Homo-oligomer: 242 residues x 6
Amino acid sequence: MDRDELVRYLDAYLRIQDFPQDPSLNGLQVEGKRTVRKVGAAVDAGEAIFRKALEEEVDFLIVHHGLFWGKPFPIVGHHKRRLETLFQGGINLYAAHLPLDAHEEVGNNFVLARELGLVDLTPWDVGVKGRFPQPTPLLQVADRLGQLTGMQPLVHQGGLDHVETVILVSGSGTGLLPKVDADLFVTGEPKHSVFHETFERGLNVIYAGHYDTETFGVKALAAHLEARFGLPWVFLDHPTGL
Amino acid sequence: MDRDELVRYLDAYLRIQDFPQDPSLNGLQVEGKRTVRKVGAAVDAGEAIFRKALEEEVDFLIVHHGLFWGKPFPIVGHHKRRLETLFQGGINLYAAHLPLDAHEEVGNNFVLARELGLVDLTPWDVGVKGRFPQPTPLLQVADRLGQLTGMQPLVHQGGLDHVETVILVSGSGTGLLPKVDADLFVTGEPKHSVFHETFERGLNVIYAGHYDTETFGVKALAAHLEARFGLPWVFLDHPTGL
Amino acid sequence: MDRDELVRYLDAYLRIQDFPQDPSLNGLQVEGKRTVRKVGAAVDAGEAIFRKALEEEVDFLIVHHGLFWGKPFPIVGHHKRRLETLFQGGINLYAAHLPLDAHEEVGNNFVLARELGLVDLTPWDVGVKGRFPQPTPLLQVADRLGQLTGMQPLVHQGGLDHVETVILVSGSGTGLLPKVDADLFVTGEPKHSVFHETFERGLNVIYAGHYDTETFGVKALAAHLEARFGLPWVFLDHPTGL
Amino acid sequence: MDRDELVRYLDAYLRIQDFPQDPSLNGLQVEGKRTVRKVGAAVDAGEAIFRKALEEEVDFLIVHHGLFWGKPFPIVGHHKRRLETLFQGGINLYAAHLPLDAHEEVGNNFVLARELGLVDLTPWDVGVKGRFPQPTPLLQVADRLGQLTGMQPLVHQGGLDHVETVILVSGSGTGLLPKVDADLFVTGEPKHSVFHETFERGLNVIYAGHYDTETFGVKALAAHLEARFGLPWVFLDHPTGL
Amino acid sequence: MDRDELVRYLDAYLRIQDFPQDPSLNGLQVEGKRTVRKVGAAVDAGEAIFRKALEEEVDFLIVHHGLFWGKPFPIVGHHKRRLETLFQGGINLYAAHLPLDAHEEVGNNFVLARELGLVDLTPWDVGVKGRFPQPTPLLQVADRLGQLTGMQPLVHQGGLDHVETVILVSGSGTGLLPKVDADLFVTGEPKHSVFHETFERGLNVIYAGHYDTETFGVKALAAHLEARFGLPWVFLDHPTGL
Amino acid sequence: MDRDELVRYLDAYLRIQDFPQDPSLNGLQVEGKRTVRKVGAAVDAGEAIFRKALEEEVDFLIVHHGLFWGKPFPIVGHHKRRLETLFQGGINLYAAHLPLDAHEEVGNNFVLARELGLVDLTPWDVGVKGRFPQPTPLLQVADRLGQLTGMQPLVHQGGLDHVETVILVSGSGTGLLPKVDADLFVTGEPKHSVFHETFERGLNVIYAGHYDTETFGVKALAAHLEARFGLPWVFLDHPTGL
């Protein structure tokens, strides 16, 4: 496939123009081969992931967390090595941050919701949709998470023992705590600074990992492109434990 | 014992003025009784810690994370309950953020660093930079930390198994990662987002918990007040696990 | 009445979401009893007004000038005493700034206009509507003001002796002087810095007091709630002379 | 007598440079004739004061509130008439805002404070802080003020009937109210919005008029020029009543 | 013609309210005679142009580059002389920056396009429309420019030798280089900082002068007013060579 | 010869730290080989200059205008080709903007000024201010400039035919025009927009090309490295004509 059409389609499909306040540079971050034959999907940009893409002969690497964030950094040290690797392999680097978080079809959140049970889905803040029944299951939604992640999540029960309304927001959603108005809140990374507030306000919160929750978008996205363009794809795994 | 006397001391001693920028409103955050007889020390301001202060007749509660962060919120829900408890027990709430991270005699970093065996200590941002008198195995440092807090720390070994120069910044210090230039960096909370950079740069980092690294200052300061004015004190522990 | 419904209704009725650039924190500023039985209305928040609300057994105090303005202040001194009073009386504090100024039904300005004569009403800048005929009365609209206020207003006649178009803007509207395009401008507080401009530009301006002009909203609002919910109300008077 | 010579003097003497922040464009605001023979002094720049300067053959008009406030406006209406008058009489417009509030020899605050009997004067923001040699009754201070300006001042007595430490900030100084820490605070214009805080904090404040407190500096400075260069001067009075 | 109607019409016709982010103060910058009898058009405000307007008895001078840009400057030196000249001649100064650049009827760009050949016109960024066929002419559009300007333009050919799509943006459009997506880009002033980028990206760029390209709006505008109001006009020429 | 050694030298020597504000990322912008044998000097970073550096075995390329300006862009098109070329030749890219404009020994301004015959040189913004030992005809200065760069400079004579005090600010220095207070001002690129101000103020200005005035520093610095470390160097010329 022509790389320039793939980039055009993706910018369109994810409509990255709708998230102009995302620090990360969404879209094609590093140019590679003009002819794409194999898609790679991964959570984070990094030398390790890049070496794996090189080994798996990936031509178009899609990541949720890219290389740019408004901060211009010198192409020195580990920044240089990363580029040498992409260059060496003619690898295209396409980054999708907030827009991949929010997307209703392949977005981290909508996708995870479904693979959980949530129904009556509706968007909630960027990146997500959250809030929508089951109805009435215990708080052992902590188990579906665990088996849908391979890792037992951290749960902070300040409220109920049974939840109905659930708001999802992968990655670092704690900043959104104050607006949470569901029986349960699902996110990835836990912050010490929100501990007491969570209980005092009787909130139920499950932390399933920043990596383990932002794994769902890239995968969906790659699968989507294979359905519509027949591009084969591979998932490049780099668990961080956070 | 006089409350306004104790506050002028702390402000001067902590050099509250040298930290204009700290989003935390440093100093007396909530006025309580005038005659202080027993001091209280705690990492976080919260209902659970306030009730404990109440139960133990604490007259002056010193906290590291206070209630104000330059963004006024309405007195409702948990916020109102928090003030009512303080009012009930006529408790003074004194908050010290950066001033206490940085203090050379009772601050979080200088105190932990000293107990950790580091020497030749010098200010480094709000933390400190020093060294071990001789190359020290990284696991042995991880252990000392574990003994000091009762919890085995998370170790990200991107470099050698031995270290000698160290940077210590308690709490959530991952923001300073790019500026780190020592064999080892000890901080509180880890962040998924600096994982790859840690290893690609070959940095050795040990995360010992936000709560567990920020208990030293508050304690050293109460102890200091007891030595200076004879005020008895208690530590109002409420481990967060983060 | 349930306090939470009263707060929901008010936020709706005044549609405080339309004035996101108001420094004051509009809405419920301090929580009190959940069951409202008597409404209090006053121009300014303050210990005196609060003691009176306590004496009149007010459960839900509505003020135009509340406690918060983006500036986080320590709960010390007079700030603490104010809260003790609201707490002591289970008094709910609801503040309505710009939205109470502008409201077309109970807003300071629209209401005052009508009680003056103005017809063909239409909004003009936030807080007001201003500009609309009589038609053709002398400048002794300064007298209706005085008897509709109990105090003779200050009048600066730079233009006509008879006015037709009148713009109203209670409180401190002088900042809006440069845009005034009516035969007369009505506001509350006079500023030395606009003296010469007012005459040189042949403007007619009447200053009827900051307090005396922002008295009309709270009253209307309280009367509205009694018409729709049968809540009785009382006006808490604290004239400042400005 | 040489106009550029007189301007370099004033800029240096007034220390115009030490006030970068002053929104007022300090210094020569409108160039006039080169040979200065008679100086003029006035609180405000305005058509009425400019015509008076014209009628009295004023060559160099020193003003406290000039025409520029870092927000360019078009030369139309009263703005153009203002410049035409200055051009007609070949009048130089020299404006000094904060530099003249603060000057220790001819500034508004130091001069008034001295005539008011205060001693041990020291800078306090752009005003001054000092004391009476002995506890002085508040009404006796109010009277001295009244004799000095010809108008009885507004007295907000939130504290004792006697005072000794005083803060003096001419003009609209109510902004510094929270920082005030003296038995008395004398300023120009009062503000409805700081009324309750004045009394709740127990502060004694005397408002003597914006115009009436800002006539001292301009006068002291002309008088100073006469002593230094023999230039005759006049005071172009135009009381504002505010 | 009544000057106030002329100003109202112009503000309307150019709809200057649509360009609120233009540093220059668009509209009537300096007031003159109320009765307009002769229009003057010129590229830049300046003493020379003003003296010529005085000589040609212009009553209403229209310029693309006016006197104000948000920066308040003292009416001293050359700024004073400029005003004396406008005053002396009762000359009205009307400035039109971005809005005259963009206007589809008399705008610098649309007008120049037509006088060049471009068809299928459509706006592109402020000030212009750019991009639209011929179709297929060599790069000797550099000659039409030259004869339509009296001066041979500077041409930087990095791309084709024959162009079809052309984007126009008079004055200093280089800042827009990165978004240029046509076979040719037309602007007035060349910048050293865009040299290499222009070739490396295979862009064709023709620099026809800042003065020589922003000559077209004022002229059209004046001609428009003569067609609709019978006001005669004259063009005041001040070539700068840039 | 050691690359990290050469970089610490340059940073210190150039006083890179004293220029925090420079939008240019000063220092090593792209890491290359560790063992430096031949230095390269050039005004601009660009593909044409990089290829030349490659062809001449340049190991360390010193440039005045680098690739980074605190606004990260994606590695695509010419941007990627630029890095590939540097990577190919293992070339280090060291960029010095303001530090090199201002350096007293090898900076652009001090060096040119000295070769131009000026004396009593002192810093003036990032340029320099000095004088000729005796009144010098403006055309004779224009000629010296012409001999120094091989191109006759543009002369805007708004003042006398003779000059003695001079301000020199290479590159695009027209921004400092309002602050200029010398008989002559020499800079690189002219700007249409400061044309009238130049003559109305009576200023003498000579524009000698952005590229032609910014070749001195880069050259002086390589020459300096050769004197200090024996490193041979070449000048990679690519005149821009601007």
